[PDB]
RNA sequence: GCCCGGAUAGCUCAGUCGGUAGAGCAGGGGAUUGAAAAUCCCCGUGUCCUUGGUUCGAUUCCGAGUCCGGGCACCA
RNA sequence: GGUAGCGGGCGUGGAUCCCUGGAUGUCCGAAUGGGGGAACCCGGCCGGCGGGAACGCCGGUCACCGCGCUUGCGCGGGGGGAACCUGGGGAACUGAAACAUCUCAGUACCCAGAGGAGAGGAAAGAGAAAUCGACUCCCUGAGUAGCGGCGAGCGAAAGGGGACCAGCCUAAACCGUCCGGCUUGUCCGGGCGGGGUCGGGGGCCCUCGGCCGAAUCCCCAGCCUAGCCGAAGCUGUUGGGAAGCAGCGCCAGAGAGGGUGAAAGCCCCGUAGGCGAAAGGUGGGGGGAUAGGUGAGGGUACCCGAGUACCCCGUGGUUCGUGGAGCCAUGGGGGAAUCUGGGCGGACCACCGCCUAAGGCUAAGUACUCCGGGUGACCGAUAGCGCACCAGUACCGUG
RNA sequence: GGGAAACCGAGUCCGAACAGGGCGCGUCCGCGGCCGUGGACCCGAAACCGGGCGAGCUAGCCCUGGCCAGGGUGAAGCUGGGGUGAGACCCAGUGGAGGCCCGAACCGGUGGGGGAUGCAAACCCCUCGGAUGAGCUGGGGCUAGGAGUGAAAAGCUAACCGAGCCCGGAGAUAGCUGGUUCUCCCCGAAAUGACUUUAGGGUCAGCCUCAGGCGC
RNA sequence: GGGAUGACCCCAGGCGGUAGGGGAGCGUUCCCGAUGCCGAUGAAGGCCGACCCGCGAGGGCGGCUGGAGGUAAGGGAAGUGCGAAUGCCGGCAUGAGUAACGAUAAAGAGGGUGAGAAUCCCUCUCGCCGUAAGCCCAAGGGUUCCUACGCAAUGGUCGUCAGCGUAGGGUUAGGCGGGACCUAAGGUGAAGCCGAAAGGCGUAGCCGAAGGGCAGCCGGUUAAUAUUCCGGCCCUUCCCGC
RNA sequence: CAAAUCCGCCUCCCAACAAGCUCUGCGUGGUGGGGAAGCCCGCAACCCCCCGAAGCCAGGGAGCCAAGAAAAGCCUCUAAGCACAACCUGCGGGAACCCGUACCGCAAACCGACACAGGUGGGCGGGUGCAAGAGCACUCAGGCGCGCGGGA
RNA sequence: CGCUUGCCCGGUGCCGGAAGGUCAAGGGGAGGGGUGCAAGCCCCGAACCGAAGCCCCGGUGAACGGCGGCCGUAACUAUAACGGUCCUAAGGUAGCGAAAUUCCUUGUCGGGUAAGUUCCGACCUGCACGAAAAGCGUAACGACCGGAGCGCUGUCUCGGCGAGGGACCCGGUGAAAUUGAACUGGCCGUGAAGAUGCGGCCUACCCGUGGCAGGACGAAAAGACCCCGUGGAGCUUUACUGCAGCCUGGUGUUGGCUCUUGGUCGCGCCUGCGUAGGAUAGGUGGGAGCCUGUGAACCCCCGCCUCCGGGUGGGGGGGAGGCGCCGGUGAAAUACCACCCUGGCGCGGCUGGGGGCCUAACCCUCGGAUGGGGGGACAGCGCUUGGCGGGCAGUUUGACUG
RNA sequence: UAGAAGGGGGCCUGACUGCGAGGCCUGCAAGCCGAGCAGGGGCGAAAGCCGGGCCUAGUGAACCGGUGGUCCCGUGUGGA
């Protein structure tokens, strides 16, 4: 699934199996014994964090963890209550 | 093809951190006992592969040649 | 209405009939009060009807999600569409005279989204020209340059001819205000407003002020949705019938065509030519109005889009299949600078040049044909659409 | 025009070479024959892949109901009697157990005959297996295509399953088999060789034909 | 060879033919020729001929049929010629008056009716079923129920008959069965979790029945309905008032 | 998942293969209906014995191991509330909606292209005889002779 | 159910082994190269450290599996209790045996029959039984397969008669596969080698109805069998290549405090005893002076190293003296000062391994918690490295060929 | 084939570079024989002979790579 901050989501990539010797060394070069489709995923993770009274957690790529703690800070100038951890986040840019 | 180890007594192997060439086994002479062994004394044996060079000389230290032994790859 | 028949009616006091606007429109269906085996059952609240409290009708109103403004109130969305379009996923038969890389192919297909189109789009561009100057589309370039078990095969771009013609708004410094935090400070950060948009510009300090103009609104012309006017021939004869044949005439901006008992410019409907809208659509094509935008110096060096550029690992796009492998995109790890900044010109270094990434919009030229009209060295009932006829019907299948 | 190219040019390339030697004197449209790419003369597979439709037939399990005439055998346990120091134990009576027995309904299919353009795309007659259980059965549910289910045959999954049906890719491919439509005139073959994952298929040579030229 | 090239006369040779190569023609559809030409005193198409012209494919001529179209000379395009494909569509033949007429429970006579009766109606004999071949419900079917007129077809024969044709009748509920009650497997699904899209899970809730809950018995009437209509006896809920 | 006078746990007066209060079945019951075989369509009893369920009283009893649905209606306990409400027991008068109901239904009307010798769940299924029975033979009620026939 | 289930861990599998060999990314960088005028910027790259797997050492049978040959010998002959020799991981035990296993085979004896390739009992030269793909047995059970008797019969010698439903004749209704056209005979021959159809001869007036199956190479199904096609599809494995899954090193999510050790670069101290020689000489260069109130000679208290000869560092006292050249020996000589690792200690940076304890990420739990317990930087997950991998997929497995 | 191709010695390296008229063989592509000119050599006094071996088998197209050289190309220019 997808990063709530960065918008990164799984992609398709190939998997190329080669044998043989680099041309760059010894020679003749490499042959592709096979190729298959497969997918790469974003290293994502949970970040739980304070903000107001409620708990509110984010499921974000590891590479943007910081950007959450940054968002917490710059929502210090903002009126936040209402039994709605759900709307805090929604109202959280 | 590329990177490691090695050659020393008949066999199998230990060495000065440059100045000594040494073990075990086998073979041989004797001690021995009912037989065969196991004890125990005693000796034989060298171009240290190899040609060069460092050096006061070198088995050791370094260029190089040679063969035996490993290790990892490529093959149109 | 497709009219025949009973059995009744209407109309120059202008009917039937055609165009435009409105009214009414059960039940199902995205289906939305709730339920459900689609067209059926069952409710709440407010009002109405019956003698009407129990019963039953009638009208109004009650789904969920997303955005905004004091929990209510406002805007929106949902589904369908012959092709045509963009994005996310994405085969195999086959070809290679076997097959595995390669090919068929980013094809068939699935999914989401857009609209009368869609996509793209104003240079971190092309590439070698003392060069060009957004994007799309056609003709060349060219089966060229290249890619390739260098096999089978795949296959660019620049440049030249045309079509169309258009350019714009923000982020950031700096300034003002409203609100809510803190360690109550000339402070931190949030919403508006102002400033500001570039191949060098902008901000801040000090000395000089004028046209360009909508893609937004308004008005017209024209056009679509009913219709109207239209020239000129008689007789005889053969014949079931004249439009044939014969005598004597006439029109033509009209001798396209169809019809009439056979074969007709002048009998009928038309054709050439010319007319017409109260109402609804359309509409810079032609006129008007705003919104918006236009200079120069000299100094400070405060700002120019960040987990980004950049390097490394894994992949995709391109003619490029690891190759000397750049450029453009990016899942993972590390990780800057603000113009003495940064990317590109096919590893790399140095010279010489090109361009300003990390926010957005933007007509026209192009695509398709459910729909209407025009044509045909197209078919003429085993043809042509599957259907000229009551056909996606009868009939076949659980579907 | 030569050359891989730099390049040179009526020449140019290998070469030291005024040796030798290799290559070096029209276009446009119409018409007709043949070739390449596209189904490319027409009909035909067994199969492969994609998206859907099927558990109202059949297989398993889940929820809730229903059904099994009448006979037969007689487990344990009770109660009494006996036995012993106490007991084990042994008798009678009672009692009604069980993937027990006979046999309908009901579930099944063992042997033989009939049927064989059938009454019937699995039937009929005689005979036979089970029948309180690992039992049969109605209604409501769930699992699917390299997947389900299976007391296990590769069985079943809507009258043909060693991988269902429908539509599409699609006019797959088919070195194989079949078929190919009016008339007259002139000429008229081959069934050999070489190579071929080749051997009933091909490529070159050979043998048929037409046009132009040459002329014993 | 003539050679007044005449495509006509004279002379001399060649002419079996599969795969194939080459050369000439004939016919089918459509276009120019066309605002023309033929045509009811008869177009196209159809049927006949012993006649005329062509080597032949073909083309003329004549007679009958047909009733509104046809289209030269000279040229141009192509869906252009069938006997075979276990070819495709349709029509009609052969087997042939042949095998069959769907349980071996079984028939006979007399009266009706009618154009017409082995096959319809009535009566009397005979035979077959009777944990059925009888009666009552559930599913599924969808007017087949009842009546009046009928018999072309459907019926394995016949048909005056019918589950057939035309037309009109006929299904009545507080208490029977479902729904304005309940929950079962399972399904759906607030909160909530997951997945490239499509979508997959899931607490409470909701749907879901032949299981739980729940008030009707005995008689009579129709051509065709009956715990539904009618009669006697016996019940259940709501609402208002005392 | 204390809110209870209800449940559940202790403790002690009475009371116990009972009585008492309940709730079903069958019997009877005011009275209402029905009512053969027989002639051309028609006279109005209803009593006594015997066999007897697999049905009823039903949540009955015993034995056994494999240890045998949920929820509402229905009783009771209290919450907020409310006590001029509100329930409960009689008695009177009102009110009581939607859908199905013909016919075939082991079959010629359903599944099998057919008026097909096949397939199809629940209840009733009389009498006599053969040991029993839903078995077998005949037979009640009721229904049929199977939509081609005649001769040899 | 009963009685039992022997021997072989060479090879395959699985289980155990903190050593050792091989080993990918990664760490590390001796040294090389391209370019710049250079600062630099760019490529390659050797030692060494570096997982799972593999090698290696062991275990393991109700784990895959396996369980011998040739010659000789007893006072008749026959045969061998005994013996020799080769091979193996080990050489088949008990029990059964011409068998659902036996080729030779109808083995040979016996039983049953008048006669018995079958059947039952025996014997073994078991082509080719054998212990949990169990061995030898076993009351009761069986629409299972074999061999026998008794009873009874149309099964048969060997057929007969009879019944009903069809077959046949008449009235009504009326199909089918098949079909080049047909005026459709025998024998010998002939022919693409099995003739109604050609040749010669022989037979035979025209047309039907009930019967039979020898022929029309009769009908039906574009042969399963055999080939053939560089045709298809299901199954297998130590066939090829991949993929799901599982294992594993480095990273990220990932943090505190200790102890213990590696490798590297700094520096600061040591380190060295052949023969001779004052005495324990590392090299090479410098070198005529150095040391002491920056308290020297001598003694005692005390650490470390040793070739046991000595070398060297501290503390306390004490007082004014110490060394080299020269000399002499040796290849090389001395005091003092330099760069230099031959090996070692001490603080340093720089990364890198193992042990513990913590709690605060992550995960599990607790009468529902802004909290308490438990695990804990491990586990899970992202990217990446190498391995195992018929559990799954695509395919290849030649031609000639009397 | 001894009128040496056989046996023995001396000096050598033509087991050359650049070409090659003309033919054998032949579907293709391959295989074979080769006089002669230029250059620089060996043996011989010279004539001359030598472009491996008495002769006919001892072999493998293209593709992809390795090493050593050289006139060539070198993605704006120099170099890589």
From Swiss-Prot:
InterPro entries: Bacterial_rp_bL28, Ribosomal_bL28, Ribosomal_bL28/bL31-like_sf, Ribosomal_bL28_bact-type. It comes from the Bacteria. Disulfide bonds: none annotated. SUPFAM superfamilies: L28p-like (SSF143800). The keyword Ribonucleoprotein applies. One of its GO terms (cellular component) is ribosome. One of its GO terms (molecular function) is structural constituent of ribosome. Pfam families: Ribosomal_L28. GO terms for biological process: translation. The keyword Hydrolase does not apply. Keywords: Ribonucleoprotein, Ribosomal protein. NCBIfam families: L28 (TIGR00009). Belongs to the bacterial ribosomal protein bL28 family. This is Large ribosomal subunit protein bL28. It comes from Thermus thermophilus (strain ATCC BAA-163 / DSM 7039 / HB27).
């Amino acid at each position: 699934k997808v990063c709530e901050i960065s918008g990164k989501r799984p992609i398709v990539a190939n998997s190329i199996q080669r044998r043989g010797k680099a041309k760059r060394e010894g020679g003749v070069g490499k042959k592709t014994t096979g190729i298959s489709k497969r997918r790469q995923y974003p290293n994502l993770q949970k970040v739980r964090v304070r903000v107001a009274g409620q708990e509110i957690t984010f499921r974000v790529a590891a590479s943007h963890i910081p950007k959450v703690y940054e968002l917490v800070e710059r929502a210090k100038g903002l009126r936040l209550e209402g039994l709605s951890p759900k709307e805090i986040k929604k109202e959280l840019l």
